[PDB]
Amino acid sequence: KHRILITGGAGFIGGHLARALVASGEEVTVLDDLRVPPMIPPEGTGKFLEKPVLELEERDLSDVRLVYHLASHKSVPRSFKQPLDYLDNVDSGRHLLALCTSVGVPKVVVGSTCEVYGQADTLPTPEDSPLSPRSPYAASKVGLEMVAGAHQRASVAPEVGIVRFFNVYGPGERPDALVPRLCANLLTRNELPVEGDGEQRRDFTYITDVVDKLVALANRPLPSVVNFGSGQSLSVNDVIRILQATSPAAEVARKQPRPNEITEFRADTALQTRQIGERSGGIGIEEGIRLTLEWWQSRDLDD
């Protein structure tokens, strides 16, 4: 048992993770059914299984020591329109963890999200805070966590760790998320869309930092649940500001607010710091946005 399998491994976090592990000398399998088109063609990320997580089989796992489960439907606003489709997130986790148990896979990292906290009543938000999902997507991640929790309580393989990602951004991320949306809109429309008043706040972490942290989990005991966030929040307006510092001509296009909007996500990082320590560096928001925008600038206008 030596291979790493990454579900969602053609997508934004999973593709970067796959590339870093292959760059490190690891034997990597990516599993991804390409149900959303990847920004970056999958080439170079290892053996590729182009199927749903639900079609994973025993033999796909037979030499696998570690799984990163990152395959998800991940859109908060769209989950209000296709709520039943989001049940696939629960089905897939139930299937994956069942198969890992029957085969004896040693470790699984399960991707979850700060959205399971809803609007938390404790800021910064610690991992023991209760669950208050405000969308069908968030509800589906709560379901996925419940499945993983049962495996955590069971005294059988895999060791299962839940990672609650806060907002991750960077090159390669599709433009339905804030930073890339703003970039893609700034470039094709000279517009910076703001949904609602823009006072709502998110905790942003740059993709390379998140990948470094995920890799640090490959060779340490997994915490049952850990926040991956920066520990600081910024308003949508703060991000807008940073971009207009770059493009003063940009027009802010007011959009309609989201339903059940969350005013602030902010990670408590004490557990993260303890389990995986912290490195000096890390990409600040100014630089991260710039690197993201530059990446978008190297994309052909049609995009």
- What is the contact surface with ligand NAD in residues (CB under 6 A)? 7-8, 10-14, 32-36, 38, 52-53, 70-74, 88, 92, 111, 113, 165, 167-168, 174, 177
**SS3 category, 90:** helix
When the beta carbons of 237 and 275 are compared against ligand UD1, the nearer one is 237
Cα–Cα distance between 101 and 142 in angstroms, integer? Answer: 21
Which does residue 10 bind out of ligand NAD, ligand UD1, none, counting CB within 5 to 8 angstroms by kind? ligand NAD
88 interacts with ligand UD1 by CB under 6 A = no
Cα–Cα distance between 140 and 90 in angstroms, integer? Answer: 6
Which of the 8 DSSP states describes residue 40?
A: S
**Selected range binding ligand UD1 among 32-40, 151-159, 187-195, 210-218, rule: CB under 6 A:** 187-195
Which of the 8 DSSP states describes residue 254?
A: E
Q: C-alpha dihedral over 101, 10, 33, 3, to 10 degrees?
A: -30
Which does residue 204 bind out of ligand NAD, ligand UD1, none, counting CB within 5 to 8 angstroms by kind? none
**Selected range binding ligand UD1 among 95-103, 112-120, 243-251, 289-297, rule: CB under 6 A:** 112-120
Nearest approach in angstroms of CB 190 to ligand NAD is 25
Backbone φ, ψ for residue 129 (5° rounding): -75, 150
Q: Among 231, 258, 264, 271, which residue sits at the site for ligand UD1 (rule: CB under 6 A)?
A: 258
Which does residue 193 bind out of ligand UD1, ligand NAD, none, counting CB within 5 to 8 angstroms by kind? ligand UD1
Q: Is residue 162 within 8 Å of residue 145, measured between CB atoms?
A: yes
- Please name the residue that has the structure tokens 């309580």: 153
Is 207 labeled as ligand-binding? no
Q: Report the run of H or E that residue 236 belongs to, with start and end.
A: helix 236-244
